[PDB]
Amino acid sequence: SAVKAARYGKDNVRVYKVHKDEKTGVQTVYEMTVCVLLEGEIETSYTKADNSVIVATDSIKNTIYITAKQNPVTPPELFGSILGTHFIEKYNHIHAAHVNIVCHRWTRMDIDGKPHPHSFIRDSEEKRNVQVDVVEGKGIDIKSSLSGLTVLKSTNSQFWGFLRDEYTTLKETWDRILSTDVDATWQWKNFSGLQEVRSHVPKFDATWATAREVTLKTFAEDNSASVQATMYKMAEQILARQQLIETVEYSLPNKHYFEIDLSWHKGLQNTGKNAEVFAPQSDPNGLIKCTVGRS
Amino acid sequence: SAVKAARYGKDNVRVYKVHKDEKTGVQTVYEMTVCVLLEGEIETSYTKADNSVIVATDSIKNTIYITAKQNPVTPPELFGSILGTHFIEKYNHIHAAHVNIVCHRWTRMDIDGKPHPHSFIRDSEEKRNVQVDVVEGKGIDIKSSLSGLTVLKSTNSQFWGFLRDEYTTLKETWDRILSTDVDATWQWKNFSGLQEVRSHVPKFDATWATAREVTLKTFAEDNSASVQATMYKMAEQILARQQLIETVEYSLPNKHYFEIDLSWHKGLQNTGKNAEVFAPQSDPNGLIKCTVGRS
Amino acid sequence: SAVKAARYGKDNVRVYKVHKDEKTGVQTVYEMTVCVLLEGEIETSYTKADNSVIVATDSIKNTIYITAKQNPVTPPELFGSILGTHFIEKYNHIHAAHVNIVCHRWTRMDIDGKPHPHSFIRDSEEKRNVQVDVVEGKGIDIKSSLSGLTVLKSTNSQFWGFLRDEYTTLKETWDRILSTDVDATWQWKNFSGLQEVRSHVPKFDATWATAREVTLKTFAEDNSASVQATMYKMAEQILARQQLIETVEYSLPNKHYFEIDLSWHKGLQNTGKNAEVFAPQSDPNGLIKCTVGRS
Amino acid sequence: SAVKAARYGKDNVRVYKVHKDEKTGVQTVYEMTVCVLLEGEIETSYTKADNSVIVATDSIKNTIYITAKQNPVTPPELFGSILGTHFIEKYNHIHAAHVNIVCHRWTRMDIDGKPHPHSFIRDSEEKRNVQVDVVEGKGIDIKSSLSGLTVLKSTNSQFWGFLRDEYTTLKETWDRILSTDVDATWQWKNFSGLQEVRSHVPKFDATWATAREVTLKTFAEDNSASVQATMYKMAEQILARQQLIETVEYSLPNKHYFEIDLSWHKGLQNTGKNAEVFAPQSDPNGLIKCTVGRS
Ligand SMILES: O=c1[nH]c(=O)c2nn[nH]c2[nH]1
Ligand SMILES: O=c1[nH]c(=O)c2nn[nH]c2[nH]1
C-alpha cells in the first residue's frame, strides 16, 4: 500500500476580533470559524510513525490567533491568503495550505435611528465564506461564497412543459410558491501570490455585495419558468459585472409548499386560485445545481 | 396504578398562509409551527383500550388547517385562542386545550429601496411564540415570547464584587464582552374567553414590539453590572408600559468570549487593554433567569 | 416591580472521569453534561447591582470538577445529590440547588469476543438523565429518566374505534407501523438528605435497568391498541417493581410511516396487505403523554 | 456565458421497506435516505426555459419508490446501481446518474435472549453509505462508506516527537485520551455495468463488515503513535483483505479531552499520572485525512 493523498490540520477554530477607533469610539467586531489543512512531504507520519514532519494541529490553532492579531481579518479572501501563504513560506516540507473561513453576521444595532458604537445583532444565519488554496509554485486559488440566504416568493413562479411519462404524477402549474436556500460561489482567476491578492482587495467586498444584490433582485423580479432558468439569469449577471471571476456556481434546494385539499370538509375551497393555506414540506426537496463560465 | 395526568395531540404542524390584497396586488405570508395538546375525560384510552374518547391526532392536524383557512392567523395570541376554544366547545369530554405556536420570520424584501409585493427573506432565526392554555371554566391564559434574539456588545459590560472563596478563580473585570440569546416571556392577565381576547387584539403586536425595543435599547445602553442587573431593568420597563401583563420572565445564557494570552509568542500583547483577538466558547455557558411581577 | 423567582448558574458543563483498576488494568469511563442552577437570597444582584450575593457561575463550574474528582460520579442520582447538597451547606444564603445530569453512553468494546480493558464505543444517542432538586428543609427530590431510545415495530400495532366526525379523514387500521422515541421519567419518594440517598444507592442502577427492560419488552410484545394503551402497561409494571417510585411519566412521539399508493403506475399494489414500501414522515408527529401514580 | 456543468434531482427522499417471511413470520426492515442527481443534455432548461428536457424531480421521487417496490434494497451498492442504470437506460438525453444512499440502523431487538420477529431498535447514529455514479459508456463507480462511528480509548495513545518552533505550546505526551468519529470510504474497481455489480453482490456486505471490524480492532489494539499512524494501519489491512477495492480513505477528527489543573484548590492532584477528571472540548478539533492505494 502507498499514501495517495494526505491532508491534516485544525477545524472549527472560532475567532473573534474587535477593532476600536480611538477618535470616534466606534467598535467593529468580526467573528469567523476557520479550518486550515496542510499537505506536503508528510507521508512518513502515516507510514513510519515519524512525527518530525508534523506541524502539530495545536500549533496551527495558535498560528491562526497570532495571524489574526497581526493582520486585518477583512476581507476574508485577504486573511485566508495571508494565513495560507504563512504555512508554505515557514515550513520547507509543506507545499499546500487549504483555508476555509465562515464569517458570522454581527450587524451594528440601530437604537432610536442612530448606529450604536459597540452593540451588534445576529441578523440571520446567512454566512459569507471563502475557500483559499495556496499551492507552492501554483499561486492562490480563491472561491468566495454566500450561503444560508433563505427566500420565498408567494407567486410569479411557474413550472410547466416538463417531460411526462408513466413515472409522472406532477401537475403543470402557472402559479406556485418558490422558496430556496441560496448557496452561490464565485471562483476568482488564479492569483500569482499575496501581492496580487492585495492589489485587488477592494473588489472582494464589492463582488460579494453585487452577488447578493443580483441574487435577491433576480429572484424577486423574474417570472420564473423554473429554478434552472432563474438561477442561470443570476449567474450570467454576476459574470458580466466582475471580469476577474471565471465561474459562478449555484446550488439551490426547491423547498416545496403543498396545496391542502379541504373540499372533504363542508366543500371548503383551498386549491388553485382559492389556495390560502399550504403545508410546508420538510423533505424531500429538489436540488438544482449549475456552474456558469465564460464562452 | 391510576392516571394522574394525561395529554395528547399533534406536534410540529407546519402551516403557511398567504393574504392577497386584490386592490394593491400586495401579498403577505405567515408561516408557523403549531402544537395542540388536549386534556379531559380520556383516562379509559390508557387504562381500558377505549379509543371512543380519542379525537385522533390526525383530526387535530386537519382542524389546525381548517381553522387557519377560516380565521386570521395574526396576531398569534388570537389564532391560538380561537384554536384552543374550538376543541373545548366542540368536544363535551375535552376540558383543556394547550396551543403552542412558533412564528417564523418572512420579512418583505426591499428591491431598489421599494418594498416588493410578493418576495420575502428570512432575516434571522428569531421567533415570536405563544403558549395558549384554554381551560373549561377558567378562561384563557396566554404567554407571549420572543426567542432566538442573539446580540453582542464589545464593551460597557463589567463583572466585579462577586463572592470570592476557595472555589473562585475568576478575575474581576471592568470591561468585557457580553453576548446572549434572549428568551423573554410576558404573561397576560387571565382572559374570560374569546370575546375578551378579541377586545385586546391591538395590544398583542404592540406589546411584542415594545418588549423587543426595550430589550435591544436596554442591552445597548446599560453599563451592565451583571446579566442579572441588566435583565431586571428590561423586565421593569415592559411591566411599566403594558398594564395587562402580570409577569415578565427572562432566560439569558452568558456566551463567554475568552481572552487569549499570546505573550509566550515574541511578547505579543493581547490581554486587558491590549485584547483584540478572543476565543468564543461554545460551552459551558452561564444561565441567568428571573421572573419579575408587580409589587 | 418585584423579583418573583430567580435562579442562575452554569449549563452545558461537559465532564469526563476515568476509573483505573490497578489490579486488573481495566479502565471505566464516565461522560456527562451537567447543569447547576441556584436559588436563594440573591434578589439584590438583580435589583441593586449587589454582586456580593453571587457565587460566580465560573466558580460553580470549578465546583463541579472538584466534586467529580473527590466523589463517585455513578450512580448519577448520588453524584447529583452530593453536588446539590454542597451548595446549600457551603453558602448560608443559597436555599435550593437544581442539578441536571445527562449521561452519555461509552460502552466497552468486545474485540474477538473479549471485553477490551480501555476501548469504548458510543452505541446510540440514548441518554440516562437525572434531575435533583435539593431544597433547604425539604430534602432531596430526584427524577430519573431515559431518553433518546428509538424503536420501531413493523406489525402488531392497531388503531381503530376512535371518534369520527366532520374533521376526521383517518382510516381505521388493524395493522400499522409503530415507531417512537421513548422519554420515560420515574420520580422517587422524597429523601430526607444525603444519608438516605446513600442508603438506597443500589436501587438507582437496578430501577434504570428495570425501566429500560419493561419499556422494550412491553413495546415488542404488546398487540398495541394505541400508544396510550401500550404506554400505560409500561408505567403500571415499573410502579409494581419499585415501591420507592411515586410516579412514572412517559412522553412518546408517534413517528408516522405512510403507505404509498403506486396503483397509478402499471397497477402496482403497495397498500393494505400488499404494503412493502412506505414514506417515513419527518413531521407532523403525534405526541402522547401520561403520568401514572399509585391508587 | 455558457453552462460548464449542471446536475439536478431530488434529495432527502426517505424510504422504508419491509420484508415478510411467510414461513417463519420474521419481518426485516430497511430504512434509507436517497438522493438522485442527473446530468445530460439539459443545458436548454437553464438557458432557454426549455422544460421539455426536464425529468421532473417529483418523477425522480416516484421512480425511487417504484424501484424499491420492484427490486431488493440490499445491499445498497446493488440498489444504487439499479436506480442509476434505470435513468440512463430510460432517458436518451440523460448520460449520468449520481445516487447517494444513507442506510439507517434498525437492529432486531433481543427480548429474553431471543431475537424478536418484528421489533427493532436504533442502536447508534452510525450509517452505512454508498455513492454510485452511473455514466453512459464509462460503467459504474461505487464508493462505499461507514460514518458516525464514535469511539474513545482512555490510554494507549501517545503523541511526541512533533515539530517544535516559536508557534508550539503543545507538551509531548506518552499517555492521552484518543476519541474520534470514524468516516471510512472504500472505492471499488470500476464495474462495466449491472451484470458485473450483480456478480459481486456477496462481497459488498462482507467488505463493509471487514472494514468495520478492522477499524474497531486496530483502534482498540494499536499503541497509537498518532492518529496518522493508526489510520494508515487500518487502511493497509482493508486493502489486503479485498482485492476489488482500489483505495481506502479515512477522515478522522481528533476530539480533544483536556486535563484540568485543580492544584489551585487545596493542592488537588489531577494532572499527568493523577489525571482522573477531564474537560471534553467541543471545538476546535484536529482533522486528519488520508487516501491509501496500491503500490
Ligand atoms: O494524533 C495527532 N496528530 C496530530 O497531527 C496532532 N497535532 N496535535 N495533536 C495531534 N495528535
Ligand atoms: O396510537 C395512536 N393514538 C392516537 O391518539 C392517534 N391519533 N391518530 N393516530 C393515533 N395513534
Ligand SMILES: O=c1[nH]c(=O)c2nn[nH]c2[nH]1
Ligand atoms: O453577569 C454575570 N453574572 C454571573 O452570575 C456571573 N458569574 N460568572 N460570570 C458572571 N457574569
Ligand SMILES: O=c1[nH]c(=O)c2nn[nH]c2[nH]1
Ligand atoms: O423548478 C423546478 N425545477 C425542476 O426541475 C422541477 N421538478 N419538479 N419540480 C420542479 N421545479
Ligand SMILES: [Ar]
Ligand atoms: Ar431561483
Ligand SMILES: [Ar]
Ligand atoms: Ar443582558
Ligand SMILES: [Ar]
Ligand atoms: Ar408505545
Ligand SMILES: [Ar]
Ligand atoms: Ar485513530
Ligand code: NA
Ligand atoms: Na514550503
Ligand code: NA
Ligand atoms: Na368541553
Ligand code: NA
Ligand atoms: Na444554605
Ligand code: NA
Ligand atoms: Na441515456
